[PDB]
Structure 1
Amino acid sequence: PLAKDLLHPSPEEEKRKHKKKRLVQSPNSYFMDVKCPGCYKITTVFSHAQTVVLCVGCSTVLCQPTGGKARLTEGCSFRRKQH
């Protein structure tokens, strides 16, 4: 194809492109409002935390750093947010 509309890229393909190769650079990560079952307080954790984080009171662990997105502990309620 020759005629495209790079001014108005469709969102289905815009999320496909690499984070830097998009029309306007935008990250793929986000933040969380995680609540472990042992406690009630809400902590803000990063999608790709890359460092082990503990709940208040040394209740339990929340995240395991991996190659990509951190592995959330099963049983903890998390709500993705955005600004």
Structure 2
Amino acid sequence: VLAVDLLNPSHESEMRKHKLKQLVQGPRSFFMDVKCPGCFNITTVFSHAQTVVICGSCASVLCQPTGGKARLMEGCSFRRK
């Protein structure tokens, strides 16, 4: 207090702040590639998806849109990158 290093804020002090209020604003979302439980194709999905996702092969709904992070109910071994 009364003397801080605004150039290099702590990572913990940054992950607890709003995305806009950070020193340099950045996204908090990401994309992950999921696999159908009974198939072999891999489809990339968004963490904040607003639309019903359907796998390319014969499969049911993937995730349900919501206000925040959508919930995955299919048994997909998702890899996030």
Please report the TM-score for the alignment, with normalisation by the length of structure 2. Answer: 0.92
Unaligned runs of 5+ in 1: none
Q: Shift of the alpha carbon at 1:15? A: 0.9
1:1-83 paired onto structure 2 within 5 Å: 1-81=1-81
Deviation readout 1:41-74 (Å, 9 max, x if unpaired): 1111000011111112331221110110011124
Q: Shift of the alpha carbon at 1:39? A: 1.2
Dislocated runs of 4+, deviation >4 Å? none
Give the Cα–Cα distance (whole angstroms) in 1 for the partners of residues 74 and 58 of structure 2: 17
Give the Cα–Cα distance (whole angstroms) in 2 for the partners of residues 13 and 38 of structure 1: 43
Unaligned runs of 5+ in 2: none
Q: Does the CA contact (< 8 Å) of 2:41 and 2:57 recur in 1?
A: no
Count matched residues: 81
Q: Aligned AA for 1:15?
A: M
Q: Shift of the alpha carbon at 1:19? A: 0.7
Give the Cα–Cα distance (whole angstroms) in 1 for the partners of residues 34 and 57 of structure 2: 15
